[PDB]
From a paper:
The closest contact is with [name]-F169, which forms a hydrophobic interaction with the C6 carbon on the aromatic ring of guaiacol. A broader survey of variants at the [name]-F169 position (amino acids S, H, V, I, and L in addition to A) confirmed that [name]-F169A exhibits the best catalytic performance in terms of both specific activity and reaction coupling, although other small side chains (S and V) also permitted reactivity with syringol, suggesting that these may permit syringol to assume a reactive conformation at the heme. Each protein variant also crystallized successfully with guaiacol and the structures showed that the orientation of the bound ligand remained consistent with that of the WT enzyme. Furthermore, comparison of the surrounding active site architecture confirmed no significant deviation from the WT.
Our recent characterization of a two-component P450 enzyme system consisting of a reductase, GcoB, and a P450 oxidase, [name], demonstrated that it demethylates diverse aromatic compounds, including guaiacol (which can be derived from coniferyl alcohol and represents the aromatic functionality of G-lignin that must undergo demethylation), guaethol, anisole (methoxybenzene), 2-methylanisole, and 3-methoxycatechol (3MC) with similar or greater efficiency than other O-aryl-demethylases described in the literature. In the present study, we hypothesized that substitution of [name]-F169, which has the closest interaction with the bound substrate, may relax the specificity of the enzyme sufficiently to permit the O-demethylation of S-lignin type substrates.
Residue numbers in the entry: 5 to 407
Write the structure that this text describes.
Amino acid sequence: ERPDLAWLDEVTMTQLERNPYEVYERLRAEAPLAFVPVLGSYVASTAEVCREVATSPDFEAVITPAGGRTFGHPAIIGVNGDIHADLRSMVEPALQPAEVDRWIDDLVRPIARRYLERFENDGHAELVAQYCEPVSVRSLGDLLGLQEVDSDKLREWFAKLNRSLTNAAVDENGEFANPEGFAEGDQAKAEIRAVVDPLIDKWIEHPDDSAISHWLHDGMPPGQTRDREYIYPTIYVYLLGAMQEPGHGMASTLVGLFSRPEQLEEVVDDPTLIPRAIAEGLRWTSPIWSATARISTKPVTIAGVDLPAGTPVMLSYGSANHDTGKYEAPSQYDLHRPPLPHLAFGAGNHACAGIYFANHVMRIALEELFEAIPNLERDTREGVEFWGWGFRGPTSLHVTWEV
Ligand code: HEM
Ligand SMILES: COc1ccccc1O
């Protein structure tokens, strides 16, 4: 236990969920790599340390304790070596930029229009539930082969998987403080299996262009498929972050633009600025804020801490994206911030595989939104509330517009 960080003993899980930024501002200044008692783990808070751990030859992927309870094995985020290579080879084809460009417009734009058509004449909406999350999950759901799973269900699953994977609080002995907080995740996985098992049954016999059918068949000997147990954890990885994050990215971007009304106006008038707006939104409130981790594979010194082999380090990329070593006034959304590298997609061998896809999903969603509702205003009756330490995003985004 590090004496000058005794105050970390009093940091609570709820505090980190409500707003982790004050604690992490202290961490970035005091201890870029610091053992946080309630999390039971070292956490990397600065860009330099997060990038170093994520790319180091002396680290490899590890799933967090709560992530492991949520996804099991072999979750693509938590494995290495040959299994990771296979799972990356499995997911990467549909995510290849040239492939995404072939169909992303015809995938996402009709979906965005569909959800827009339900409310664009109302003069008010709650964009997280009515637009950002449905576009995000409907787009990926259709890509995966889950066309028949309604957006409400996909959204419920990622919400439950989120809370399960981020159920990280531990007591003084390192045991989960809230062991009952995984049951809901277990329930969501049971539901998912009930839906996806017959789809897999079908895809084994009748492959199609769905991503999950390709996960079963691609690269396999004739007549063989990857075992469903082998791919289910990566399905869960998708049904959490891949479903959740584009929607949170677009919503956080809107919140940031609303916080800079002149920049909102600039982006509406010039939608070519939407990619920049999104990249700044992801830096400003990173959707994957501290969900993943790495484990040292040999003794290594990181930020002056001599870590034994086998030491987990949580990658709080959301804090790294407020590193004042890199950014001026990082808590302020600023479209006109110089484009600098950011860590919202992680780094290294286990960096986000779906960056190009995700950026286009968010781009197209905001393009259609601003075209349909160019006079969007935030419902300033209250502030926007953001929630989450592992994954972070606005819980709601009430807007209005003159009809
Ligand atoms: C704005 C949206 C998204 C953000 C901010 C995001 C961010 C991230 C981050 C931070 C990680 C962990 C990287 C690390 O630990 O170093 C990750 C992993 C991953 N993401 Fe993305 N993600 C997004 C959307 C998506 C989508 C839509 C997909 C799939 C279509 C996807 C697929 C993956 C995969 C497969 C991994 C695991 C990579 C590995 O462990 O090898 N992501 N993502
Ligand atoms: C792409 O989905 C994830 C990424 C990182 C951690 C958990 C996830 O479900």
